[PDB]
Design a protein around this ligand. Structure first.
Ligand SMILES: O=P(O)(O)OC[C@H]1O[C@](O)(CO)[C@@H](O)[C@@H]1O
Ligand SMILES: [Mg+2]
Ligand SMILES: [Tl+]
Ligand SMILES: [Tl+]
Ligand SMILES: [Tl+]
Ligand SMILES: [Tl+]
Length: 329
């Protein structure tokens, strides 16, 4: 009751040995504030008339929902005022943001201020996704600072605005979940050092693209429905919000897929602020994340809005699909 283990404390205590400036704690503290404000807005969006659109095609293309504008604004201002960042990349901005000299810190943050657009109006779970890099150049901060492989990630995670609000945070030693206590406006640790199961029993994909699927994906789904060894067929789940589907994959095991298809060679999801953060999380929890041909975290991007196919979850499920891709190649 009286010794509340918050995100702040846990992080602080974490690297109490790896000393450091602590701008990471400032950074994460800042992010938490934006997440709380988004959570509150989302929980009353129909009352606050925050459903519907802002109107406009996003980066490569996307409608802008009002909550999208709001959430983007919040995350950018808090990151800026944290004094811990120098370059910001957001799904909503064509170019990377360069923070003014007086507020610069050493971290680069890629984020999705609000992911799961198609699910906003029907009240399904939506979320916020982020990845944080240390700046490694020495020259003036620039968009190039964001074009790093996910492998260089120092911290990544997401806020899930589901039946409860959860902040899932991955760093070099592992994954931990923090749940928002709406009463005191704190993120409290509820799951420590989370590890994904080796094999799950759920598969998650939009089968409405069956006509555009590659034969590897096709064969894999067929094997989930009609197991060659007479084992029970997998259950299917597709919430439609990547944060919800991936979070369930994390805690129940199984696999999540947004693969390349006949119309999308690089898939749909964005590498920098959608695929890489989730890959990292998944990798720190003992899972895998591939395009079907290579590790997502090993891709060196050339576009901050670059797309990538992604398959992730329990290692033995992901490895089974990879085997099918390797067979078809
Ligand atoms: O409607 P589709 O093509 O299945 O897209 C769903 C995906 O799109 C997203 O909203 C991101 O654009 C993800 O949250 C979700 O995984
Ligand atoms: Mg978005
Ligand atoms: Tl968007
Ligand atoms: Tl959105
Ligand atoms: Tl996307
Ligand atoms: Tl997007």
């Amino acid at each position: 009751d009286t010794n509340i283990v918050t995100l702040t404390r846990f992080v602080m205590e974490e690297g109490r040995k790896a000393r450091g400036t602590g701008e990471m704690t400032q950074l994460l503290n800042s992010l938490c504030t934006a997440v709380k404000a988004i959570s509150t807005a989302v929980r009353k969006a129909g009352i606050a008339h925050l459903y519907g659109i802002a109107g406009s095609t996003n980066v490569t293309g996307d409608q802008v929902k009002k909550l999208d504008v709001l959430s983007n604004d919040l995350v950018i201002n808090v990151l800026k005022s944290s004094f811990a960042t120098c370059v910001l990349v957001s799904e909503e901005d064509k170019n990377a943001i360069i923070v003014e000299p007086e507020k610069r810190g050493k971290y680069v943050v890629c984020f999705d201020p609000l992911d799961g657009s198609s699910n906003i109006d029907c009240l399904v779970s939506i979320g916020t996704i982020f990845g944080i890099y240390r700046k490694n150049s020495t020259d003036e901060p620039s968009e190039k600072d964001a074009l790093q492989p996910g492998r260089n990630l120092v911290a990544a995670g997401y806020a899930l605005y589901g039946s409860a609000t959860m902040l899932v945070l991955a760093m070099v030693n592992g994954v931990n979940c923090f749940m928002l206590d709406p009463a005191i406006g704190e993120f409290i640790l509820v799951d420590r050092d989370v590890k994904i199961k080796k094999k799950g029993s759920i598969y998650s994909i939009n089968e409405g693209y069956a006509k555009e699927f590659d034969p590897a994906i096709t064969e894999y789904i067929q094997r989930k429905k009609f197991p060659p060894d007479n084992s029970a067929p997998y259950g299917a789940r597709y919430v439609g919000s990547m944060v919800a589907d991936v979070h369930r994959t994390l805690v129940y095991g199984g696999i999540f897929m947004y693969p390349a298809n006949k119309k999308s060679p690089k898939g749909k999801l964005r590498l920098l602020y959608e695929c890489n953060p989730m890959a990292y999380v998944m990798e720190k929890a003992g899972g895998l994340a591939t395009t079907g041909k290579e590790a997502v975290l090993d891709i060196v991007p050339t576009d901050i809005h670059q797309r990538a196919p992604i398959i992730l979850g329990s290692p033995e499920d992901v490895t089974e699909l990879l085997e099918i891709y390797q067979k078809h190649a």
